[PDB]
Amino acid sequence: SMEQVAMELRLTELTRLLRSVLDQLQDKDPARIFAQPVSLKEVPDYLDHIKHPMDFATMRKRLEAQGYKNLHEFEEDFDLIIDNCMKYNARDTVFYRAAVRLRDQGGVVLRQARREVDSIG
C-alpha cells in the first residue's frame, strides 16, 4: 500500500536524524569508553551485575536495521549506557566520571533532537 510506503519513508527519515544524533553523542566520548560492549572474557561477572548491557556499537547495529521506531526507544538505549556504567563502577573512577560527562553533554543534543522529531513529525 501507499500508506505502508509513507510510514516506511518516515522511519527512514527518523533513522537519518538518529544517525546524526548518535554521531554527536559519541563525540562526547572521545576516550571511546562506551564504543563497544563490555567484554565477558575481561569482566566475567558482568551479567550478574548488569542485566541489559548497552554500548554505541550495539546501538549503531539497531539503528542501521531501522530498529528504533521513535526517539524514546533510542534514548532508552542511551540511558542504559550511562546508567549501567554508573552502577558497575564507583564514583572515583574514570569510567563513572566519563558517564556523567556523557550524560551532561548529551542532554543538550537530545533536547534539540526531541524538538526536531516533533517539529518535522
Summarize the helices and strands and which ones pair or pack.
Elements: H1 2-27, H2 46-49, H3 56-64, H4 71-88, H5 94-120
Helix pairs in contact: 1-3, 1-5, 4-5
Description:
With 121 residues, the chain is mainly alpha-helical. It has 5 helices and no strands. The protein has a single domain (1-121), classed as Bromodomain-like (Histone Acetyltransferase, Chain A, Up-down Bundle), CATH 1.20.920. The protein has helices spanning 2-27, 46-49, 56-64, 71-88, 94-120. This is Bromodomain-containing protein 1.
Concise synopsis of the structure shown:
With 121 residues, the protein is an all-alpha fold.
Key words describing this protein structure:
gene regulation; 0% strand; SGC - Diamond I04-1 fragment screening; mainly alpha; 121 residues; PanDDA; Bromodomain-containing protein 1
Q: Helix tally?
A: 5
Q: CATH homologous superfamily - what is it?
A: Bromodomain-like
Instruction: Please identify the structural class as seen in this structure.
Output: mainly alpha
- The percent of residues in helical segments reads 55-70%
**Strand runs, count:** 0
| Number of structural units classed as domains | 1
Tell me, what is the CATH class? Mainly Alpha
**Percent of residues in β-strands:** under 5%
Report how far apart the termini are: 21 Å
What radius of gyration results from the CA coordinates? 16 Å
Largest sheet properties? none
Task: Please tell me the CATH architecture by its name.
Answer: Up-down Bundle
H/E series: HHHHH
Shape: globular
- In the CATH scheme, what's the topology name? Histone Acetyltransferase, Chain A
Protein name: Bromodomain-containing protein 1
Cross-link (Glycyl lysine isopeptide (Lys-Gly) (interchain with G-Cter in SUMO2)): 41
Domain Bromo: 9-113
Subcellular location: Nucleus; Chromosome
